[PDB]
Amino acid sequence: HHHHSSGENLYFQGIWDRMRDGFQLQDAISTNPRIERQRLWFLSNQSFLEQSSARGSLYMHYVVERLEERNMPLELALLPVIESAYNPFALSRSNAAGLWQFIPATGQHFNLRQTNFYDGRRDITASTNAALTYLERLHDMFNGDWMLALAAYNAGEGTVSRAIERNEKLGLPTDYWNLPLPQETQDYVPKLLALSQIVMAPDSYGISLNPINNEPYFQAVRVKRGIDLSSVAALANLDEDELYQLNPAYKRRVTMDGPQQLLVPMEKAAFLTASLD
Ligand SMILES: CC(=O)N[C@H]1[C@H](O[C@H]2C[C@@H](C(=O)NCCS(=O)(=O)O)[NH2+][C@@H]2CO)O[C@H](CO)[C@@H](OS(=O)(=O)O)[C@@H]1O
Ligand SMILES: [Zn+2]
Numbered sequence: 001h002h003h004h005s006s007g008e009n010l011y012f013q014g015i016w017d018r019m020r021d022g023f024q025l026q027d028a029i030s031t032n033p034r035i036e037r038q039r040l041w042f043l044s045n046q047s048f049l050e051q052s053s054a055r056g057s058l059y060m061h062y063v064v065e066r067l068e069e070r071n072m073p074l075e076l077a078l079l080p081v082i083e084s085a086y087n088p089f090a091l092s093r094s095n096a097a098g099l100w101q102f103i104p105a106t107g108q109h110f111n112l113r114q115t116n117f118y119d120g121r122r123d124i125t126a127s128t129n130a131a132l133t134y135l136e137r138l139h140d141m142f143n144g145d146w147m148l149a150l151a152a153y154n155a156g157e158g159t160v161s162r163a164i165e166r167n168e169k170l171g172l173p174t175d176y177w178n179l180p181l182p183q184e185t186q187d188y189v190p191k192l193l194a195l196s197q198i199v200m201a202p203d204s205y206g207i208s209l210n211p212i213n214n215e216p217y218f219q220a221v222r223v224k225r226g227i228d229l230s231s232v233a234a235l236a237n238l239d240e241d242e243l244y245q246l247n248p249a250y251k252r253r254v255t256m257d258g259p260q261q262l263l264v265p266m267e268k269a270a271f272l273t274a275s276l277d
């Protein structure tokens with residue numbers, strides 16, 4: 001690994017190059033049929049990544065910065081693509097919510113509060129920090145192995161541990177690829193690896209990625225609880241829809257629960273701070 005400071009990080013031309021700089025899993029990848037299968041899916045469903053990237057442009061700078069600070073694999077900045085298509089309103093059949101697809105119980109473990117009007121799993125900053133912590137902890141639990149960490153993120157640490165124990169007793173290898181996991185978990189890791197290979201060298205697959213500037217999109221500003229999204233949008237001449245996309249924790253755009261804080265476009269943050277005083 002290497003590190004870059006705040007100063008150096010500014011010099012990347014776009015977010016894709018910045019993300020690629022911190023990839024940590026590429027050298028470990030081999031020719032697996034499981035990876036190829038997932039790579040084919042991305043090529044034959046090209047609108048998927050394009051739509052994910054357009055939505056993700058709101059959030060990717062923040063995610064990348066958090067990953068860099070913790071020296072975690074920047075391939076994880078693509079995990080919300082796989083999990084939610086970078087749609088923080090996505091809700092799975094298991095009730096997994098937000099960019100990072102926390103189920104209620106795991107959300108509660110990380111103190112992501114769920115009321116009738118606020119879901120901290122959808123909250124961009126809270127859910128991101130919780131997801132990275134969970135992934136780091138899982139990685140540490142499986143002796144530094146990011147593949148097993150990812151598998152446990154999807155299937156639970158118990159499932160993965162039991163699969164390891166089961167293979168050990170049979171005298172079989174205990175690496176991710178050899179574990180008899182649920183099919184969703186079997187596909188999970190190769191999906192991320194496949195996607196990361198395309199992001200690393202998109203030309204080689206006949207793909208073009210939407211350029212995304214290497215700049216912050218939003219800034220947090222304090223807002224007291226008696227102020228709705230519409231009023232904030234009016235005050236700073238913001239698009240209310242974009243503001244909702246930046247603050248998806250608030251169900252029906254109701255801001256009565258949760259933190260006294262909104263993410264707002266960087267360019268308006270100073271004015272809003274001053275006007276709310
Ligand atoms: C981040 C998160 O909440 N991860 C949890 C994961 O969610 C998974 C579930 C999956 C999901 O929603 N699957 C259904 C998809 S579909 O609706 O059928 O398409 N997506 C989430 C993140 O990968 O499910 C397992 C098992 O329950 C949990 O482990 S356990 O608590 O030890 O059991 C684990 O904590
Ligand atoms: Zn270091």
Ligand SMILES: [Zn+2]
Nearest residue numbers: 002004021022
């Ligand atoms: Zn570098």
